[PDB]
Amino acid sequence: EAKHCVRIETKKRVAKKTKVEHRCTTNKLSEKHEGSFIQGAEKSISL
Amino acid sequence: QFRNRVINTKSFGGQCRKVFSGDGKDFYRLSGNVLSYTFQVKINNDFNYE
Incomplete structure (x- = not known):
């Protein structure tokens, strides 16, 4: 999980002006690596 | 390949x-001239599982 979430606000007065913004960018990632490998051999020799 | 009767x-x-064959439990008549004919048994087995 990764998050970048930011809130900015500003008022200025002289007349008045204001700005307010919120951004929140986010990622989530998952990986699953399941695996199997079975092997075998049999010799038989009879006389 | 084996070919015809020579x-x-x-x-x-x-x-x-x-x-007496021993194996086969019977009596057989050989030809007069055959140098030998015998009935002892051998077996060979090979498995390769992989």
Whole structure:
């Protein structure tokens, strides 16, 4: 999980002006690596 | 490949050459001239599982 979430606000007065913004960018990632490998051999020799 | 009959394997020559097969539990008549004929058994097995 990764998050970048930011809130900015500003008022200025002289007349008045204001700005307010919120951004929140986010990622989530998952990986699953399941695996199997079975092997075998049999010799038989009879006389 | 084995081809056709070249030798007469059954010329008994007037002999009564009995052999007991032991295996097969029977008596057989050999030809008079065969140098040998014998019935001991061998077995070979090979498995390769992979």
